[PDB]
Amino acid sequence: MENFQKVEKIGEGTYGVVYKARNKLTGEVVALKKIRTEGVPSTAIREISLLKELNHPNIVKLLDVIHTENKLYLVFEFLHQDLKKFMDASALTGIPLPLIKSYLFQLLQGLAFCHSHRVLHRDLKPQNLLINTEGAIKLADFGLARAFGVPVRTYTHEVVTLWYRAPEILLGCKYYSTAVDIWSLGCIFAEMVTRRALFPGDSEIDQLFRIFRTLGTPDEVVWPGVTSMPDYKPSFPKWARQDFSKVVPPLDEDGRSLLSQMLHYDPNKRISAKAALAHPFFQDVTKPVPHLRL
Template identity: 40%
Template sequence: TFGYVDHVRHPIEHSWEFARKTIKHNDKVDFNGDISSTTIREISILKMLDHPNIIKLIHVEYNLNKKDFLSFFLEMFPIDLKRYMDACLSTERLSAKLIQNYTYQILCAIDYLHRHAIIHRDIKPSNIVIDYDGHLKLTDFGLARRCHLHEQALTHEVVTLWYRPPEVLLNAPTYGMSLDIWGVGCVFAEMCLHRPLFRGECEIDQLLLIFRFPNFPFNSIELSQLPMSRTCRQFLTDILVYNPQTRPLAKQLLEYHRYFTCSSNINLEKPIKSSIDRAIQLQTENMKHIVI
């Protein structure tokens, strides 16, 4: 889908802000007034979702006679998780409590999606938005699909490379909801390490990096080398399971894993305000150089 995202205010209630995703006519695509199936699917899925950790669709506008012929308005959140981590200084890394809280919220969103037979298919930090108070929401459902079977044949052109599970990289004939769980593991590791865990340059390189991880035969990475607590290491290895059929469900992780059950309660943890402010400033400066 060709388009862009910007921020707009309500024409009357100026304190209300929205994120507007606008789909443009593009000379590379002949829309003929038709909306792409991907866009229709994204809008229909967003309309049916209602969860505190999933971005809310507010309104959709369609005007065939305008250049920007389709816009949908979403809840406004200040910044995404990737930009926040990029803006954090070395002394401002995510605290253990914040990582636990964010991971919990991500899994709550994934559990809700999977209970409604929906796979997100693109879990990564830039598709997760946060605010100053510690709230987190999953966004960008452009690749999301309904999946009524545990596993079924779906396109393999999904998931950004660094967050792609082995079954997709190996072109398995089917895959299922455990694809999202692998993505959660990669995001969790990135929050802990402050860098992506598997930074492959191509699919083969990505597979080689994954096969070096401690869960896999012939690995060359010592788990103790990863700068995280023992509980975090165990949580990571319990998620990044090679066989998708034995990968845990989001519900199982939330209810039974020691990473969450060892805490008496999981309250909201506020991120560092100065890092969010810096991320917003950098985003604003970068937008000045983007030509749509």
């Protein structure tokens, strides 16, 4: 990559290292990602290349896909900060509600766009939601989970987080619907409000039981077909459902209503991104600018 001048390391992703770099010919500043492999499957190349046309203001733009010397490089639009770092930096006082609302509204717009084109993300987390000084937030890595799969550990052996994984995935479902992304965004929404992760599991069963302890152990009444799922066991403990007023205080009733619909157990009934954009919670939405010291 002598076409790019490395400025500095941004971090370590799931599949490889990420660098901030400058296009020596156009002066463009970008994010360069190296991806895991005896030559890279051809099926993955075709799938990823189609993503170059999935353009929207709330989706991080894929500039180029380069396969050479059996290595894979993805060139992306560059943004200065990610939501995980912003949340940590905002721990003492918390992110103001008008900004939490603006970010959720924008994220739902990005999901509605991708979902209308039959593309899901499958592994949303604060670390892949990027922000700028203008008040915008964008979703990164849409479509990569399908092409490469989601591993148990990263290329550096770090544990891939389970905190935002939908229950149907944990129970062994073979086919994923767009509902899996709505679940993840709901968990992220709750974390911005309370300043603590909603379901911080440290194993697949710990993650599932934390969900059950808060929302109640699911049954055929709320989730038709749950007892027939691949990893369901009749021996699961039976916990009672808790009140949202206790789960996400001090969020108002419009906010609690919307979150409850984003965390519905049955994937077929969970609210869609398009329907969520019309929820009363967004009646007074605005576009504030965050305080960023770069």
